[PDB]
Amino acid sequence: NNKSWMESEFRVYSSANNCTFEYVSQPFLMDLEGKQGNFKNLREFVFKN
Amino acid sequence: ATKFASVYAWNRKRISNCVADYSVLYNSASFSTFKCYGVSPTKLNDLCF
Amino acid sequence: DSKVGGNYNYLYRLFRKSNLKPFERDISTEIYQAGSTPCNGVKGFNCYF
Ligand SMILES: *[C@@H]1O[C@H](CO)[C@@H](O[C@@H]2O[C@H](CO)[C@@H](O)[C@H](O)[C@H]2NC(C)=O)[C@H](O)[C@H]1NC(C)=O
Ligand SMILES: *[C@@H]1O[C@H](CO)[C@@H](O)[C@H](O)[C@H]1NC(C)=O
């Protein structure tokens, strides 16, 4: 019933044993509310190694 | 550091995504001995690791 | 040319101000100022023969 959306489960991995690289940018906030309607924001990403 | 580990369980800490300013390290005369076995001590500022 | 106690009669120029000339000769024993500090006398910290 509560209009709240927050991170609750970090169900991604079990062990991070021998790490080498970490990248952390400055803290900020993003909207986790369940926005409805037609898709307004368009995000285009390109990855290459 | 306030307390160092001992030789039986020598602590190992990682260095990443930094600029390793060896100038202050080498110029600090508080150290007793300083011996590099692989490369010339003065040139660590040039060859990137 | 070898002795059980170590034939230390043989030496080499470990330090010099720069690269040498072709067929260059030098018997200099002047202490090299390895550290940024000026070096006087004949010995001292970071003063390498
Ligand atoms: C990163 O660390 C892990 C463990 O801390 C290394 O994996 C170990 O490798 C040794 C010998 O290769 C094995 O005897 C251990 O059983 C391994 N332990 C684990 C948990 O895997 C791993 O080799 C390290 N990575 C690198 C690149 O050195
Ligand atoms: C909403 O949050 C409050 C406080 O965290 C909690 O008491 C309540 O039960 C929550 N809503 C529902 C429907 O459980």
Swiss-Prot record, chain A:
<feature type="glycosylation site" description="N-linked (GlcNAc...) (complex) asparagine; by host">
    <location>
        <position position="18"/>
    </location>
</feature>
<comment type="function">
    <text>Attaches the virion to the cell membrane by interacting with host receptor, initiating the infection. The major receptor is host ACE2. When S2/S2' has been cleaved, binding to the receptor triggers direct fusion at the cell membrane. When S2/S2' has not been cleaved, binding to the receptor results in internalization of the virus by endocytosis using host TFRC and GRM2 and leading to fusion of the virion membrane with the host endosomal membrane. Alternatively, may use NRP1/NRP2 and integrin as entry receptors.</text>
</comment>
<comment type="subunit">
    <text>Binds to host ACE2. RBD also interacts with the N-linked glycan on 'Asn-90' of ACE2. Cleavage of S generates a polybasic C-terminal sequence on S1 that binds to host Neuropilin-1 (NRP1) and Neuropilin-2 (NRP2) receptors. Interacts with host integrin alpha-5/beta-1 (ITGA5:ITGB1) and with ACE2 in complex with integrin alpha-5/beta-1 (ITGA5:ITGB1). May interact via cytoplasmic c-terminus with M protein. May interact (via N-terminus) with host bilirubin and biliverdin, thereby preventing antibody binding to the SARS-CoV-2 spike NTD via an allosteric mechanism.</text>
</comment>
<feature type="glycosylation site" description="N-linked (GlcNAc...) (complex) asparagine; by host">
    <location>
        <position position="2"/>
    </location>
</feature>
<protein>
    <recommendedName>
        <fullName>Spike protein S1</fullName>
    </recommendedName>
</protein>
<feature type="region of interest" description="Disordered">
    <location>
        <begin position="26"/>
        <end position="38"/>
    </location>
</feature>
<feature type="region of interest" description="Disordered">
    <location>
        <begin position="1"/>
        <end position="17"/>
    </location>
</feature>
